Amino acid sequence: SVPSQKTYQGSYGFRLGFLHSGTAKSVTCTYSPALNKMFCQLAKTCPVQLWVDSTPPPGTRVRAMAIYKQSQHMTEVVRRCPHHERCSDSDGLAPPQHLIRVEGNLRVEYLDDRNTFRHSVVVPYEPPEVGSDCTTIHYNYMCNSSCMGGMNRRPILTIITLEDSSGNLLGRNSFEMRVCACPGRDRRTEEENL
Ligand SMILES: [As]
Ligand SMILES: [Zn+2]
Numbered sequence: 001s002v003p004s005q006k007t008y009q010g011s012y013g014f015r016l017g018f019l020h021s022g023t024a025k026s027v028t029c030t031y032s033p034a035l036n037k038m039f040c041q042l043a044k045t046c047p048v049q050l051w052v053d054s055t056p057p058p059g060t061r062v063r064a065m066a067i068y069k070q071s072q073h074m075t076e077v078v079r080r081c082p083h084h085e086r087c088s089d090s091d092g093l094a095p096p097q098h099l100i101r102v103e104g105n106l107r108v109e110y111l112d113d114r115n116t117f118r119h120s121v122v123v124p125y126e127p128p129e130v131g132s133d134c135t136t137i138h139y140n141y142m143c144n145s146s147c148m149g150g151m152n153r154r155p156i157l158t159i160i161t162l163e164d165s166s167g168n169l170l171g172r173n174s175f176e177m178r179v180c181a182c183p184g185r186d187r188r189t190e191e192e193n194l
Pocket of ligand 1: 028047
């Protein structure tokens with residue numbers, strides 16, 4: 001069935017943070033607080049911050065999964081278009097069908113769910129590096145929102161779950177995602193309509 005998108009900070013006070021990048025033409029990845037929507041270029045570095053009041057225990061894991069936002073498409077699996085699925089951009093870890101990848105982490109793990117056929121990517125939770133107040137994961141989105149035979153101009157949600165080493169839910173949060181050539185301009189345009 002459709003995975004839960006309900007916000008849950010839980011014991012460890014789990015919330016997401018984003019860089020305050022602005023909307024300059026030369027931006028690759030920008031977050032809109034007003035929309036709670038990320039704007040990112042294809043395959044480019046997408047920083048998502050993990051904020052906690054208390055450090056989760058050893059072997060805590062952080063899962064990312066994309067779902068369609070619209071009620072009628074929610075039961076459909078989010079996957080890459082046949083073109084992007086075929087193109088030789090493989091990192092030698094990520095399944096070629098998977099929209100979401102993590103870069104700069106050789107403990108990354110990918111799941112085709114045997115029951116739901118859902119795609120997700122999981123990394124170990126590492127406490128904030130000295131002189132930081134959050135943990136940063138670098139996500140990569142390997143299809144454009146406009147891809148015919150993929151998302152095809154349908155809005156998606158990314159759901160970020162915090163789970164312990166035995167797979168118990170510790171926390172959940174979500175943000176809308178648009179993968180597009182001009183993230184800056186598109187945020188400015190989508191914010192214009194307010
Ligand atoms: As991004
Ligand atoms: Zn595509």
